[PDB]
Design a protein around this ligand. Structure first.
Ligand code: HEC
Ligand code: HEC
Lengths: 126, 126
């Protein structure tokens, strides 16, 4: 759906921004600094699940640009493992939210955050 | 979820970018320039439905900025009508896609596009 590489870059940066916000806005809830409303968190994690599927198709071949490292494209399988692993960490968060289980939510939130870094450390330029 | 107005602006611009892409990528399909695959379009319109709910909460009071016109906030009810009307135009598109009805899809796509403009004409700076 992208006329030029720049369009893919713009898309993925926007998708990732919207993930930062839907993930990060739960930090006060996980920390207990804001109340835990199970229904609200369930709905927010559903949004996050949808968003978290979106960036990867905007790293198609030849879409070098932005802050993406070239290693995304020199080993396709390894980048795919990282995004798939990340989306499965989101599945754990979804299951916790759907269960209304705050302990579960906290653990999964931590693991999701670690997975965001795991990717950044390999694939995002400074 | 926004520390500063600038964060709300960044969010809504990213959400609207992702809507432009999920809407606009169907133009070749509606025109018949690309094949119509009902299952694919159903799934894409589901993404668009999720995205199309997201910008409006990032126009909270005091979030002037970007290319938003101030009239968003001097008549809250009228801006709310426009976003709600738009989301109901998306409902028509969703119903068409879920039915697999290409004629329906074309008509709804046109009406959605008109609704994007209807808002821009009142509420988006040049
Ligand atoms: C690899 C499988 C990634 C995972 C998992 C996550 N992110 Fe990431 N992110 C990645 C890349 C390669 C890039 C650079 C994209 C580019 O072309 O510039 C990024 C970028 C971001 C950004 C900045 C977006 C922007 O406005 O330019 C943010 C805010 C960001 N990423 C956040 C983020 C979070 C919170 C994640 C887990 C919930 C996450 N990313 C996962 C690669 C990958
Ligand atoms: C009002 C109810 C709107 C509807 C419906 C749509 N858009 Fe719009 N859009 C609106 C505003 C007020 C703004 C400016 C936001 C700001 O603070 O700058 C916009 C902006 C856009 C953009 C640019 C985003 C960016 O990268 O800065 C795009 C690409 C865009 N809008 C697209 C778009 C489409 C395709 C719509 C219908 C499917 C649509 N918008 C509806 C207000 C409103």
């Amino acid at each position: 759906q992208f006329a030029k590489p720049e369009d893919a870059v713009k898309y993925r940066q926007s998708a990732l921004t919207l993930m930062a916000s839907h993930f990060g806005r739960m930090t006060p809830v996980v920390k207990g600094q804001a109340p835990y409303d199970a229904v609200q968190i369930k709905a927010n994690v559903e949004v996050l699940k949808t968003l978290s599927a979106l960036p990867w198709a905007a790293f198609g071949p030849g879409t070098e640009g932005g802050d993406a490292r070239p290693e995304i494209w020199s080993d396709a399988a390894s980048f795919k493992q990282k995004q798939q692993a990340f989306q499965d960490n989101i599945v754990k968060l979804s299951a916790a939210a759907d269960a209304g289980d705050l302990d579960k939510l906290r653990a999964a939130f931590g693991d999701v955050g670690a997975s965001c870094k795991a990717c950044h450390d390999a694939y995002r330029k400074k």
